[PDB]
Scaffold this active site. Sequence first.
Site, mmCIF file in Angstrom:
data_model
loop_
_atom_site.group_PDB
_atom_site.id
_atom_site.type_symbol
_atom_site.label_atom_id
_atom_site.label_comp_id
_atom_site.label_asym_id
_atom_site.label_seq_id
_atom_site.Cartn_x
_atom_site.Cartn_y
_atom_site.Cartn_z
ATOM 1 C CD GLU A 250 -76.640 -99.957 -44.979
ATOM 2 O OE1 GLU A 250 -75.911 -98.993 -44.696
ATOM 3 O OE2 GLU A 250 -77.022 -100.205 -46.146
HETATM 4 C C1 LIG Z 1 -81.658 -96.863 -47.994
HETATM 5 C C2 LIG Z 1 -81.209 -95.671 -48.779
HETATM 6 O O1 LIG Z 1 -81.497 -94.527 -48.442
HETATM 7 N N1 LIG Z 1 -80.484 -95.921 -49.872
HETATM 8 C C3 LIG Z 1 -79.936 -94.874 -50.704
HETATM 9 C C4 LIG Z 1 -78.430 -94.971 -50.684
HETATM 10 O O2 LIG Z 1 -77.980 -94.762 -49.372
HETATM 11 C C5 LIG Z 1 -76.800 -95.467 -49.021
HETATM 12 C C6 LIG Z 1 -75.584 -94.565 -49.007
HETATM 13 C C7 LIG Z 1 -74.675 -95.222 -47.966
HETATM 14 C C8 LIG Z 1 -73.775 -94.206 -47.296
HETATM 15 O O3 LIG Z 1 -74.250 -93.333 -46.568
HETATM 16 N N2 LIG Z 1 -72.482 -94.292 -47.611
HETATM 17 C C9 LIG Z 1 -71.505 -93.304 -47.176
HETATM 18 C C10 LIG Z 1 -70.538 -93.843 -46.158
HETATM 19 S S1 LIG Z 1 -69.343 -92.630 -45.661
HETATM 20 O O4 LIG Z 1 -70.021 -91.951 -44.433
HETATM 21 O O5 LIG Z 1 -69.278 -91.634 -46.692
HETATM 22 O O6 LIG Z 1 -68.166 -93.372 -45.315
HETATM 23 N N3 LIG Z 1 -75.600 -95.836 -46.962
HETATM 24 C C11 LIG Z 1 -76.980 -95.933 -47.578
HETATM 25 C C12 LIG Z 1 -77.565 -97.336 -47.451
HETATM 26 O O7 LIG Z 1 -76.691 -98.337 -47.957
HETATM 27 O O8 LIG Z 1 -77.828 -94.020 -51.528
HETATM 28 C C13 LIG Z 1 -78.180 -94.250 -52.902
HETATM 29 C C14 LIG Z 1 -77.305 -93.345 -53.746
HETATM 30 O O9 LIG Z 1 -77.565 -91.973 -53.451
HETATM 31 C C15 LIG Z 1 -79.668 -93.998 -53.029
HETATM 32 O O10 LIG Z 1 -80.052 -94.277 -54.424
HETATM 33 S S2 LIG Z 1 -80.857 -93.170 -55.224
HETATM 34 O O11 LIG Z 1 -82.176 -93.721 -55.436
HETATM 35 O O12 LIG Z 1 -80.062 -93.044 -56.428
HETATM 36 O O13 LIG Z 1 -80.865 -91.986 -54.423
HETATM 37 C C16 LIG Z 1 -80.467 -94.942 -52.131
HETATM 38 O O14 LIG Z 1 -81.849 -94.614 -52.158
HETATM 39 C C1 LIG Z 2 -67.768 -94.783 -42.525
HETATM 40 C C2 LIG Z 2 -67.437 -95.935 -41.596
HETATM 41 O O1 LIG Z 2 -66.261 -96.295 -41.465
HETATM 42 N N1 LIG Z 2 -68.479 -96.481 -40.968
HETATM 43 C C3 LIG Z 2 -68.334 -97.620 -40.070
HETATM 44 C C4 LIG Z 2 -68.608 -98.865 -40.914
HETATM 45 O O2 LIG Z 2 -68.286 -100.029 -40.155
HETATM 46 C C5 LIG Z 2 -70.085 -98.941 -41.302
HETATM 47 O O3 LIG Z 2 -70.347 -97.990 -42.366
HETATM 48 C C6 LIG Z 2 -71.512 -98.164 -43.124
HETATM 49 O O4 LIG Z 2 -71.122 -98.682 -44.396
HETATM 50 C C7 LIG Z 2 -72.250 -98.973 -45.245
HETATM 51 C C8 LIG Z 2 -71.685 -99.670 -46.477
HETATM 52 O O5 LIG Z 2 -71.136 -100.947 -46.172
HETATM 53 C C9 LIG Z 2 -73.015 -97.659 -45.498
HETATM 54 O O6 LIG Z 2 -74.175 -97.999 -46.264
HETATM 55 C C10 LIG Z 2 -73.467 -97.065 -44.176
HETATM 56 O O7 LIG Z 2 -74.146 -95.836 -44.397
HETATM 57 C C11 LIG Z 2 -72.251 -96.831 -43.304
HETATM 58 N N2 LIG Z 2 -72.725 -96.301 -42.030
HETATM 59 C C12 LIG Z 2 -72.196 -95.216 -41.453
HETATM 60 C C13 LIG Z 2 -72.803 -94.771 -40.132
HETATM 61 O O8 LIG Z 2 -71.241 -94.591 -41.918
HETATM 62 C C14 LIG Z 2 -71.085 -98.582 -40.165
HETATM 63 C C15 LIG Z 2 -71.437 -99.689 -39.177
HETATM 64 O O9 LIG Z 2 -70.797 -100.930 -39.468
HETATM 65 O O10 LIG Z 2 -70.655 -97.410 -39.438
HETATM 66 C C16 LIG Z 2 -69.333 -97.503 -38.916
HETATM 67 O O11 LIG Z 2 -69.265 -98.645 -38.124
#
Ligand SMILES: CC(=O)N[C@H]1[C@H](O[C@H]2C[C@@H](C(=O)NCCS(=O)(=O)O)[NH2+][C@@H]2CO)O[C@H](CO)[C@@H](OS(=O)(=O)O)[C@@H]1O
Ligand SMILES: CC(=O)N[C@@H]1[C@@H](O)[C@H](O[C@@H]2O[C@H](CO)[C@@H](O)[C@H](O)[C@H]2NC(C)=O)[C@@H](CO)O[C@H]1O
Lengths: 276, 273
Positions: free
Chosen positions: A82
Amino acid sequence: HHHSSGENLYFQGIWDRMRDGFQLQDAISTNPRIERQRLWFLSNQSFLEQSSARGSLYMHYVVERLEERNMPLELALLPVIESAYNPFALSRSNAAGLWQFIPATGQHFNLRQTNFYDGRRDITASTNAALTYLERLHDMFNGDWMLALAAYNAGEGTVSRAIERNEKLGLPTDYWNLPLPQETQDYVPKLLALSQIVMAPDSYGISLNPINNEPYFQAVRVKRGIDLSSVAALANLDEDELYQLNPAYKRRVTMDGPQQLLVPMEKAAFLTASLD
Amino acid sequence: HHHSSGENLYFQGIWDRMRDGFQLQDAISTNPRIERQRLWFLSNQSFLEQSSARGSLYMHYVVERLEERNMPLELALLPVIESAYNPFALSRSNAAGLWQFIPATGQHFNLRQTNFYDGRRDITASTNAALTYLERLHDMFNGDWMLALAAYNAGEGTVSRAIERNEKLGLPTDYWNLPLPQETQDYVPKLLALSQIVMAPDSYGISLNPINNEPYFQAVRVKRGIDLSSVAALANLDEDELYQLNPAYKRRVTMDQQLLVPMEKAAFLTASL
Ligand SMILES: CC(=O)N[C@H]1[C@H](O[C@H]2C[C@@H](C(=O)NCCS(=O)(=O)O)[NH2+][C@@H]2CO)O[C@H](CO)[C@@H](OS(=O)(=O)O)[C@@H]1O
Ligand SMILES: CC(=O)N[C@@H]1[C@@H](O)[C@H](O[C@@H]2O[C@H](CO)[C@@H](O)[C@H](O)[C@H]2NC(C)=O)[C@@H](CO)O[C@H]1O
Ligand SMILES: CC(=O)N[C@@H]1[C@@H](O)[C@H](O[C@@H]2O[C@H](CO)[C@@H](O[C@@H]3O[C@H](CO)[C@@H](O[C@@H]4O[C@H](CO)[C@@H](O)[C@H](O)[C@H]4NC(C)=O)[C@H](O)[C@H]3NC(C)=O)[C@H](O)[C@H]2NC(C)=O)[C@@H](CO)O[C@H]1O
Ligand SMILES: CC(=O)N[C@H]1[C@H](O[C@H]2C[C@@H](C(=O)NCCS(=O)(=O)O)[NH2+][C@@H]2CO)O[C@H](CO)[C@@H](OS(=O)(=O)O)[C@@H]1O
Ligand SMILES: [Zn+2]
Ligand SMILES: [Zn+2]
Ligand SMILES: [Zn+2]
Ligand SMILES: [Zn+2]
Ligand SMILES: [Zn+2]
Ligand SMILES: [Zn+2]
Ligand SMILES: [Zn+2]
Ligand SMILES: [Zn+2]
Ligand SMILES: [Zn+2]
């Protein structure tokens, strides 16, 4: 039903203690998607090393919480995938903290978000909320940890809708067959692959950073107007270390937070007596 | 309601905090069996008073464990009816500790039982095991806390078999319609009745023993087999109090790595041990 109930104090290191409570190894399929994630970890070995070194601050606490609840200890690795165990990590969806709570889910769990305090980064508050959420998701999907993890990442709605879509088509409705977004397709095999490596690192030519099976921090009750700077000076603490233990405070300004502070174990008695 | 640790300073005592996390009040029927248990508590008021005075050592810890799992805070009253919050309580079926684990169930949760140590009496180990058991039972009965509580007292098998019997007869299968042994018939209404009193004590002419919303004890690491007598002498503690906080030790020899000590001596003992 491997309940430890406090005998796991005898383990030398945290990796052995974690392995003791692994529950997902028995049923790991040999789906190629897992192998694919396993190769990623082998070819990016510094990822686990850096995550482990940061994780050393937090892992003992996470492990003990999982044990108490009889939850799979593989979940102690969930912050690796995460956030790389970086509590300051913030996704483009504004997922925050070790456990990557988005604002609305954070709010649901009463993880307060002000301009100076973000409960999603708070180690103890976020961990307990994440484990509660995970347990609830597991319960919603009839005890299936694969679907629970998928729902943690994609949302319960998305997973339920994927299940119903497969039902109507006459496809199986286990995690592996669901048409989920790619992130969620990768999410579960990523955790499984990492847990396989942690279970037997020698077998992949990997060596894990030794981490002792002892608490790194202790919570200390404090007063309202006490700054991290002041605590650092009082105990001759490294201010960076105090911030890494208390990442909920943006700009390192101790405002808007609870009257509790995490401090290194070796200074805990002194600070307890000085502040409380 | 999910609980944040920022609400805590504002609570008057533990009873307010407990009420905040109650989850079973909404759906309490007005089955006469509940009223019957309520009258028992009113006419035997010393029961709750004695339980509360003992409970002052333990209730804060139990409440915090329940909150962090988002479990019903009514369960913080379960040791009242099980043991009067006395960890030395022992039924004639050898149910032991605050949570009244029988030997086999204790064994399942790796609560070790020797001639010198009984893990069922251990405050932290028994509490976390009991909450885990309760959660599992709740999950087994599709989220129904009535059936979970019945199963805690009578066993999962007994309750499941009662449900299947009613299904075959074409009766409803909710707790209230199961013809369970009398102890289990009384068990659930007892907890509900007590929670109603705790929810609104004024309304029953009751005043609850003041208990502060602060920890009574802290866990301290010990890496050797120290006598509780030795710890008591070192910190100028009453040995009785140390035993009440660490009731698992029959022989008081330890040997059998975490020790609960009064908050005010926690720092000293952390540094000393
Ligand atoms: C722990 C947490 O907050 N989980 C939420 C999750 O977050 C995810 C999203 C993901 C994330 O941020 N992905 C984006 C990565 S990037 O930055 O765009 O590359 N990381 C979190 C934990 O796995 O998104 C889904 C969908 O909205 C939510 O489901 S909902 O009930 O329908 O709202 C869920 O509650
Ligand atoms: C966007 C990105 O490249 N983030 C790096 C990933 O390796 C990793 O991303 C995390 O991926 C999860 C799904 O597998 C998401 O739920 C989580 O929100 C996302 N975190 C962030 C900060 O984008 C993490 C750490 O391994 O962040 C970077 O390192
Ligand atoms: C001669 C005379 O009248 N003496 C009075 C004493 O009787 C009285 O002592 C108290 O008496 C009550 C009985 O009415 C007793 O209440 C019992 O408490 C135990 C818990 O310790 C309960 O047992 C548990 O029940 C659950 C099932 O619900 C089990 O799961 C659990 O395992 C059981 N635990 C144990 C250890 O057996 C009983 O159910 C409960 N009986 C009820 C509610 O009817 C009190 O414990 C007695 N208290 C003491 C200190 O003895 C005394 C008041 O203290 O006054 C005398 O005059
Ligand atoms: C927490 C715990 O240990 N619960 C167990 C329960 O104890 C009960 C027993 C009861 C008790 O001791 N009753 C007898 C009192 S007296 O002394 O005989 O009057 N008090 C405890 C907690 O509610 O007994 C049932 C039935 O055996 C067990 O179910 S099983 O799975 O079928 O074994 C169940 O696990
Ligand atoms: Zn079990
Ligand atoms: Zn083990
Ligand atoms: Zn919720
Ligand atoms: Zn559950
Ligand atoms: Zn399960
Ligand atoms: Zn369906
Ligand atoms: Zn609350
Ligand atoms: Zn529920
Ligand atoms: Zn004494």
